[PDB]
Amino acid sequence: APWYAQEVKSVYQICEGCFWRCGIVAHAVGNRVYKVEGYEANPKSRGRLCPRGQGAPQTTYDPDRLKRPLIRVEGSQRGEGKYRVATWEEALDHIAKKMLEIREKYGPEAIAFFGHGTGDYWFVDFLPAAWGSPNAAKPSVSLCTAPREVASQWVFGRPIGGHEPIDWENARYIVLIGHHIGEDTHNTQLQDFALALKNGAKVVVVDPRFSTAAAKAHRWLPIKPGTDTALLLAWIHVLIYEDLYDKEYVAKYTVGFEELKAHVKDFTPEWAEKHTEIPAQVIREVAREMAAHKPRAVLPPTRHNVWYGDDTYRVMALLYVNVLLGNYGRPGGFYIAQSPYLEKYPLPPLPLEPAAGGCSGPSGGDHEPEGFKPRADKGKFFARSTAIQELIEPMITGEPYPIKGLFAYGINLFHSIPNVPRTKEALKNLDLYVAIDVLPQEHVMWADVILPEATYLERYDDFVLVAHKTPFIQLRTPAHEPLFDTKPGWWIARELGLRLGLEQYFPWKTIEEYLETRLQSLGLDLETMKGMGTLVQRGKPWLEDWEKEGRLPFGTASGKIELYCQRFKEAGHQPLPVFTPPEEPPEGFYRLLYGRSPVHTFARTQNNWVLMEMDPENEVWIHKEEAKRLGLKEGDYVMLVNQDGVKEGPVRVKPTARIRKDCVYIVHGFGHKAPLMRLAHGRGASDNYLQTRYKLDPISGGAGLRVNFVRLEKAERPRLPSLTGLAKRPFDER
Amino acid sequence: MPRYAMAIDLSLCVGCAACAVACKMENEVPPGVFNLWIREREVGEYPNLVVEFRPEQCLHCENPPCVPVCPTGASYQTKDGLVLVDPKKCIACGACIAACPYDARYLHPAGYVSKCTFCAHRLEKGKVPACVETCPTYCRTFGDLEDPESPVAKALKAAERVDVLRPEQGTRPKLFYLNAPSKKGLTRESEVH
Amino acid sequence: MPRYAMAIDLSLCVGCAACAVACKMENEVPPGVFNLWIREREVGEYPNLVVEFRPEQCLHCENPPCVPVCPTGASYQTKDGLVLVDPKKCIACGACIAACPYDARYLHPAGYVSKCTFCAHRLEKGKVPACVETCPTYCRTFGDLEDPESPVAKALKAAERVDVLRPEQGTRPKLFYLNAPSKKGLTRESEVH
Amino acid sequence: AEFYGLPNAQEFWHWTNALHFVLVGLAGGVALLAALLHLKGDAEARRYTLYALMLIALDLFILWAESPARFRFTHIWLFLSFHPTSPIWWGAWGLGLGFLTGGLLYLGKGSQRALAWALLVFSLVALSYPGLALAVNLNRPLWNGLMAGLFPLTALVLALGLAALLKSPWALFPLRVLAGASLLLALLYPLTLPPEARGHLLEEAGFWYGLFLLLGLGTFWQERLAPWAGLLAAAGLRALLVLAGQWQGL
Amino acid sequence: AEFYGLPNAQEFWHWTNALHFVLVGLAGGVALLAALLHLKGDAEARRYTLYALMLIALDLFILWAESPARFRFTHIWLFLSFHPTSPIWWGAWGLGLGFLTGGLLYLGKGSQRALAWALLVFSLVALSYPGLALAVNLNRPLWNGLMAGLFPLTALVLALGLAALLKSPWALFPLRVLAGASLLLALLYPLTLPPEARGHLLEEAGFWYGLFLLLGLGTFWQERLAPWAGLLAAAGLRALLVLAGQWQGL
Numbered sequence A: 001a002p003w004y005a006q007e008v009k010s011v012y013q014i015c016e017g018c019f020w021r022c023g024i025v026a027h028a029v030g031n032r033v034y035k036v037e038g039y040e041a042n043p044k045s046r047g048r049l050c051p052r053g054q055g056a057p058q059t060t061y062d063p064d065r066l067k068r069p070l071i072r073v074e075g076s077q078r079g080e081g082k083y084r085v086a087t088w089e090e091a092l093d094h095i096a097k098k099m100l101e102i103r104e105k106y107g108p109e110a111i112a113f114f115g116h117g118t119g120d121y122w123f124v125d126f127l128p129a130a131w132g133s134p135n136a137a138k139p140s141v142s143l144c145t146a147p148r149e150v151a152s153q154w155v156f157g158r159p160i161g162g163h164e165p166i167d168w169e170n171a172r173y174i175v176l177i178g179h180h181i182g183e184d185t186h187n188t189q190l191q192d193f194a195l196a197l198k199n200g201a202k203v204v205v206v207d208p209r210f211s212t213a214a215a216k217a218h219r220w221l222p223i224k225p226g227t228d229t230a231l232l233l234a235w236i237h238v239l240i241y242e243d244l245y246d247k248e249y250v251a252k253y254t255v256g257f258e259e260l261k262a263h264v265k266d267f268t269p270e271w272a273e274k275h276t277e278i279p280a281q282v283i284r285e286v287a288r289e290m291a292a293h294k295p296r297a298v299l300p301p302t303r304h305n306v307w308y309g310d311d312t313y314r315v316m317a318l319l320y321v322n323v324l325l326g327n328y329g330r331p332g333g334f335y336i337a338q339s340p341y342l343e344k345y346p347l348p349p350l351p352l353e354p355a356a357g358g359c360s361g362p363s364g365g366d367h368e369p370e371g372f373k374p375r376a377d378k379g380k381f382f383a384r385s386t387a388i389q390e391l392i393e394p395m396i397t398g399e400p401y402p403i404k405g406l407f408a409y410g411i412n413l414f415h416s417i418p419n420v421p422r423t424k425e426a427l428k429n430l431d432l433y434v435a436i437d438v439l440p441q442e443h444v445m446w447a448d449v450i451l452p453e454a455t456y457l458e459r460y461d462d463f464v465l466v467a468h469k470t471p472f473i474q475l476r477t478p479a480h481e482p483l484f485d486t487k488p489g490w491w492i493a494r495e496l497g498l499r500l501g502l503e504q505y506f507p508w509k510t511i512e513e514y515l516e517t518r519l520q521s522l523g524l525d526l527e528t529m530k531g532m533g534t535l536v537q538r539g540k541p542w543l544e545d546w547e548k549e550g551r552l553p554f555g556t557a558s559g560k561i562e563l564y565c566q567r568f569k570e571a572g573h574q575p576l577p578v579f580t581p582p583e584e585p586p587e588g589f590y591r592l593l594y595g596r597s598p599v600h601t602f603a604r605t606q607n608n609w610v611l612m613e614m615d616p617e618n619e620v621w622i623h624k625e626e627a628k629r630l631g632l633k634e635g636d637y638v639m640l641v642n643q644d645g646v647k648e649g650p651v652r653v654k655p656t657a658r659i660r661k662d663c664v665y666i667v668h669g670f671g672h673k674a675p676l677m678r679l680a681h682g683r684g685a686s687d688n689y690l691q692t693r694y695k696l697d698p699i700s701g702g703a704g705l706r707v708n709f710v711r712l713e714k715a716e717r718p719r720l721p722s723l724t725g726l727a728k729r730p731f732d733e734r
Numbered sequence B, C: 001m002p003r004y005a006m007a008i009d010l011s012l013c014v015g016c017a018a019c020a021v022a023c024k025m026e027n028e029v030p031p032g033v034f035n036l037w038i039r040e041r042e043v044g045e046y047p048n049l050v051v052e053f054r055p056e057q058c059l060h061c062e063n064p065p066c067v068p069v070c071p072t073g074a075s076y077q078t079k080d081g082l083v084l085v086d087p088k089k090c091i092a093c094g095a096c097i098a099a100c101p102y103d104a105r106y107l108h109p110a111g112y113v114s115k116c117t118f119c120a121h122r123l124e125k126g127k128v129p130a131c132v133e134t135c136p137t138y139c140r141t142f143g144d145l146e147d148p149e150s151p152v153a154k155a156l157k158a159a160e161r162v163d164v165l166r167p168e169q170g171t172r173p174k175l176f177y178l179n180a181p182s183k184k185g186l187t188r189e190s191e192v193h
Numbered sequence D, E: 001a002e003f004y005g006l007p008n009a010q011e012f013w014h015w016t017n018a019l020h021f022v023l024v025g026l027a028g029g030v031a032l033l034a035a036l037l038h039l040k041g042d043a044e045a046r047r048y049t050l051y052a053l054m055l056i057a058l059d060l061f062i063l064w065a066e067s068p069a070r071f072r073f074t075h076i077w078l079f080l081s082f083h084p085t086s087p088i089w090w091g092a093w094g095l096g097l098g099f100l101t102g103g104l105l106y107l108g109k110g111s112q113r114a115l116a117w118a119l120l121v122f123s124l125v126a127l128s129y130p131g132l133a134l135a136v137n138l139n140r141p142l143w144n145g146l147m148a149g150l151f152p153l154t155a156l157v158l159a160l161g162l163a164a165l166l167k168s169p170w171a172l173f174p175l176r177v178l179a180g181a182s183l184l185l186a187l188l189y190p191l192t193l194p195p196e197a198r199g200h201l202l203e204e205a206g207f208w209y210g211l212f213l214l215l216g217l218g219t220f221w222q223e224r225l226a227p228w229a230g231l232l233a234a235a236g237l238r239a240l241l242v243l244a245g246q247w248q249g250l
């Protein structure tokens, strides 16, 4: 009866639990992965796994998990949930037919491709460019990481990347700005953070909320929200003006350090304390303590940075502090992450190729005369990244041309993009909207054609390359074959690719064919790759390795500390003066903060019975004294109403103090209105549905989310089905 | 011959229920029940705010009240210190549930009572328990308490403080909490409101 | 209106019995009975020997079981948290001795129950207790728990760990043992045999 | 305060079992009546034995019909082993042997005083094991020592209350004595608890409790209300303690 | 394990307060017999009302006699303060109002048989208070919840034992009923304690304990052995529990 006593088959497999993509071993018995585990060699899991990784397999064995292709009954409105089963053949034809029509009277740029997850390579990076649409985007860019990636491209010549390059194990002093580690449960960084703590790494957390990471911190600075740049500028000021910075480091690897010293003249700990609300002594002490530890003092940059409209400034400032400490590329906090060598599968160049911009004109030069039609959000902000949230307008007004048609490859349109009413207007106006997913979420059931993807355990994917101290390559192998009528994304892409004239792209007849080519290059084949799931290559990490070779890494030959001559020029400001006092909550309201549940990924795990059973709802954090003035107590429920009147389904109130009185916090990803995901439907409040407005970062396409205010209105406890009852529905592969 | 135990460092625990989900998965624990769960409690106001994350599960008490009270002999303590259930004798009378002070046991839907097993199945084949293996923070340790080299033994030896739940029942838990966050020790509901 | 308390830093207590003797002299506590006594216990085995020197006395519990039990009303709890006996109403029935969990109470040979008094007589004249005064090792502190300038308050804040005897009882002892020498906390006789 | 997953702190003994608890009271106490009757050589000894047998049968049937392992047929282990430390084990053997002992009594086979003393001893085991099934769980603050007192006395109010409805003339006096005992100990029970446990009993129950205390007082009033009132107080009290005492609570 | 000075862990209620425990058992038990005999109209209601007044008075004297506070006359406060939380306080009034009440009943005046209701109430308070005066001390492992049951049961064994020796026809049967209830709870008591508390009890007393249990089995044999044997059993247990439970212990 127990799975482990029963015959097993293991395979080396990547976790699709989230984007960290940990290398895992999957233990299947027949057609079912009973257990998954990290493995030692893999530099991401190293034998461990976070809760999401452990529970991730049940979506594959979820009775509501999407099985057949589906097409929207003709004449029924998008939203209304009327579908009819279809054949992969019929669904795939229907999509190409429609896509082609959009392309004959509007051009291929009238098709937006949104997507996320491993297979976003096919949908967001590859298919769109092979098709000729620059309107390809992922929420991990303007709804996550854009502010820091831009900041980093301008300051260093490099990205921060998906596996942020912090040398945690040698770090001695760590400053976390909103970075919640332990709630944000990215495997390796949890491990590393924990090892740092373990070796006597003292951690400072700056956050208006006393988070998990704060629970492990030597200092908690309960910063007034949207005020971090003032604290960062004042620390910059203390390391420059008290002369604590790493002089040599700036001398040999830094351009324009002088502009920064003068800029930061008046931003004193007393100026900071006034806006920041952190006492001036504390501001000083923290900068001194970090200077005392250099180069082994790091402010690792957080991943979710859209917080407010100004965001790239805050990150730039955080990076200056790291530079001033001399930590980049030294053991202590930033090792140099090099990408592994795995040669691409040989193909003709793509109609549109990317511009990994950072300097000397990476905006719209290729967009202006260069061929056709530029990404539809081209003039909205300075940076060159595609911003998912800005290309949605074009679908409603037809402004910058028209975007009819939209693909949603594993991307939560209604939870990951703000202003859900606007996104629904935009799906209304579309000629084609396809969504490739696994569960019947609220935004999948607004599609003309739903295509059920095969899940990470039933699927091969193109390799996963991770830039790292020791770059590596990972390979996921099916643990068993797809279930029902389920197809891998490589296959769906190829099958659409053949149907829209892109055979030169997609030539290989099979993914193992594809995978054997890249393995050839490196000196192996498919079977051997399956043998050592992950492949580590030699690279570099500090500056010496670079330096002795007579080179340096960057963008232009010396990190430019103020950080970017060509923004200055035509955009207006170079330095991060925009501490820009943030608009404040109206009285009766609270700033809506949000974040992660250690056990749930974004939104997609809300139907997972193993994980929902660990955390079946979110909970609104209000200061104990506010819930008391309000008449709210421990088990009460409440509706969240934002400044624009949107109400978010009843949420449990959490009157325990670990938060300022200015704010309110809820974990992101609950509040599904998606009846077909039977155990995620009707639970918690959705932060996104309350995030009606956003402040566009004019520098890094980011949509500042923490600009929404919410007030609480007493509500009744909700009456919902029993989760155990639902969780007990047997999984039948029919 | 060994005396099996588990040590969890609370100074490192962040309450990401990884261990709880890994056990759910490894042991196929049905939906409404749990061999392992995490409790999280805050203690205190603004300038002294402590949060305790605490996984709770059979402590494999050395003096288990959950054994003598069993009518059939299904509930038994092993020579190495494991408290287990021979489902073949279990009549699901719930005596052991009444007697366990830690809400560590449940009625499995197959008609017998269940609970954390210290992954006896893995132990027997020389492996460490599922909770122990999947744990980002490396705060749990396991081993023979009698072997000075074992990871629990070491963990206990290096601990700043060691605590056990409801020590005043006299069960002698063999799941040790290291370095509790609060000065006053493990958090109790009674020290709240 | 304050909350009177005593803290004893066991990391510094050497169990010389100075406080105990200073008490006996001051309060002229009669032969055979003690407001304060020292308990010394070894927790053992060479590389890991630990000796706990622990002075014991009325903890002036915040929720004293010895008060409610009194028929007379002689056992009363004061507005600042001292448990005292008014010997005028005491009928020397022992109910309070029966209800005291700490053996802090005795029958005075003058026919009424007595026990440590937090040196009430000194507290009103604005002085610190006699045991607190004599302490060579500076390990005991006193004051109003609510005044953060208090020596108890500051010590509680500085303690690495804070313990109390029989917390499982109702009482809320207001005598805090600070840095307990054994990792498992305050020594108990059941933990020996 | 917050959990990931949940501790298994839910009710393990349901209304179903609380019923078993009221019944084994009746069973055991009627077996005591039958034993003491055989022993006085009184004529009613025979039908009280039938009843004690019936209530023993009815109680083993609902102990089995309510067992999650009712179809796994594992209760046989109850009888193939020796677990003297376990109240439920005692209970199984007392009733069981008490049902054989009372079986032979009914069938005038295998002796008859030596069988009536046996019935006496087994019916004391069966009257004794429920309060101890509760009371050995020192982690449950409501199931304190008095449960070992409340349950035997209450099992007697049930048997005698029944005996009196069946109009046996000897019983309406013992019923009032034993009901007075039970109600006095039941009234002092909450006062025997730590404050938080008493407060827990009062919040979750009480008003029921206090109603069962009043009710039982009608055992000393009108002649034919007296057994009903005594029966319902004693059964209400037994079931309420079984349901409300499943708490570990800090 | 080693001390400088000593904890005041010395016995606090000595053999004399174990003697009062036995008498207030009687005093309260007989006061109950009296009021019930009143209420019932019985010819003997007077005989037993003046006994209860002596037993009550004997105890209240032994209560002051054994108090080191006797010649300080502080007992007046027992009657000039309101202290409902205190078992002993309740027993001061229960035996005090129980006295006046039994006076106004024996001197046939101020009122009749509305006064027997008050005597019944005060006797229940007097029967209840010791049992709770022990059990209220939750720091004493041996004095668990069963004390609140073992003492009132045992006080009536004392009252009915006396009554049966003064050859009242009614007394034997209820004495052998409450004596069975008493003896069975007394047997279950050890099994109710935690293992260290029980171990303490069996090494400290027990024999003594198992003697009085055996001795008490004598209520169910002959007469003029019976009331004696049940009376020595009830007072054995009562005195021994007061003596052996003054332990705090870890």
Ligand SMILES: Nc1nc2c(c(=O)[nH]1)N[C@H]1C(S)=C(S)[C@@H](COP(=O)(O)OP(=O)(O)OC[C@H]3O[C@@H](n4cnc5c(=O)[nH]c(N)nc54)[C@H](O)[C@@H]3O)O[C@H]1N2
Binding pocket: A016, A116, A117, A119, A139, A140, A143, A144, A304, A409, A410, A411, A412, A413, A415, A416, A417, A418, A436, A437, A438, A439, A441, A453, A454, A455, A456, A594, A595, A601, A602, A603, A604, A668, A669, A687, A688, A691, A705
């Ligand atoms: N309001 C708000 N918005 C946010 C955030 C926030 O905190 N608040 N966080 C932002 C951040 S930081 C990020 S990184 C993004 C992430 O945003 P998303 O990745 O869009 O988030 P999820 O909610 O997991 O949505 C995943 C969707 O992909 C589907 N899916 C999952 N696995 C597979 C698969 O193998 N194949 C296919 N085809 N589909 C799959 C899921 O069912 C679901 O529809 O969201 C961002 N958006």
Ligand SMILES: Nc1nc2c(c(=O)[nH]1)N[C@H]1C(S)=C(S)[C@@H](COP(=O)(O)OP(=O)(O)OC[C@H]3O[C@@H](n4cnc5c(=O)[nH]c(N)nc54)[C@H](O)[C@@H]3O)O[C@H]1N2
Binding pocket: A018, A019, A052, A140, A144, A177, A178, A179, A180, A181, A183, A184, A185, A186, A206, A207, A208, A209, A211, A223, A224, A225, A226, A227, A228, A302, A303, A304, A305, A307, A593, A594, A595, A596, A597, A598, A599, A600, A601, A602, A603, A665, A706
């Ligand atoms: N379990 C789990 N872990 C995940 C994910 C998941 O879905 N589930 N997703 C992953 C992804 S893609 C991302 S992007 C991250 C998201 O996680 P992070 O990258 O760590 O996000 P942050 O927004 O930095 O941190 C959230 C914290 O920011 C705080 N905050 C809000 N406003 C301010 C402010 O003005 N100043 C300061 N200093 N702090 C503020 C909130 O209080 C909260 O405590 O986590 C990742 N890890």
Ligand code: SF4
Binding pocket: A015, A016, A017, A018, A019, A020, A021, A022, A049, A050, A051, A052, A053, A054, A056, A185, A186, A187, A188, A601
């Ligand atoms: S971080 Fe956790 S959820 Fe994400 S891929 Fe790794 S194991 Fe899966």
Ligand code: SF4
Binding pocket: B008, B012, B013, B014, B015, B016, B017, B018, B019, B020, B038, B053, B055, B134, B135, B136, B137, B138, B139, B140
């Ligand atoms: S896996 Fe580690 S961090 Fe997660 S709950 Fe268990 S002990 Fe805590």
Ligand code: SF4
Binding pocket: B069, B070, B071, B072, B073, B074, B075, B085, B089, B090, B091, B092, B093, B094, B095, B096, B097, B112, B113
């Ligand atoms: S429920 Fe099963 S394991 Fe527990 S006491 Fe009963 S028979 Fe034993």
Ligand code: SF4
Binding pocket: B057, B058, B059, B060, B061, B062, B063, B064, B065, B066, B067, B083, B099, B100, B101, B102, B104, B105, B115, B171
């Ligand atoms: S933790 Fe529970 S199952 Fe384990 S020995 Fe203790 S009572 Fe028994």
Ligand code: SF4
Binding pocket: B019, B022, B023, B024, B026, B027, B035, B036, B057, B115, B116, B117, B118, B119, B120, B129, B130, B131, B132
């Ligand atoms: S040791 Fe075994 S029973 Fe315990 S949590 Fe880990 S897997 Fe579950």
Ligand code: SF4
Binding pocket: C008, C012, C013, C014, C015, C016, C017, C018, C019, C020, C038, C053, C054, C055, C134, C135, C136, C137, C139, C140
């Ligand atoms: S003065 Fe200090 S060391 Fe000496 S007996 Fe008192 S508490 Fe102990």
Ligand code: SF4
Binding pocket: C069, C070, C071, C072, C073, C074, C075, C085, C089, C090, C091, C092, C093, C094, C095, C096, C097, C112, C113
């Ligand atoms: S001895 Fe004195 S102080 Fe103690 S309970 Fe009796 S009257 Fe009260």
Ligand code: SF4
Binding pocket: C057, C058, C059, C060, C061, C064, C065, C066, C067, C083, C099, C100, C101, C102, C103, C104, C105, C115, C171
């Ligand atoms: S320690 Fe004992 S005597 Fe002192 S106040 Fe507390 S309960 Fe009363």
Ligand code: SF4
Binding pocket: C022, C023, C024, C026, C027, C035, C036, C057, C115, C116, C117, C118, C119, C129, C130, C131, C132
């Ligand atoms: S406070 Fe006073 S009475 Fe108490 S121990 Fe110290 S000197 Fe003695």
Ligand SMILES: [Mo]
Binding pocket: A140, A143, A144, A145, A303, A304
């Ligand atoms: Mo993200």
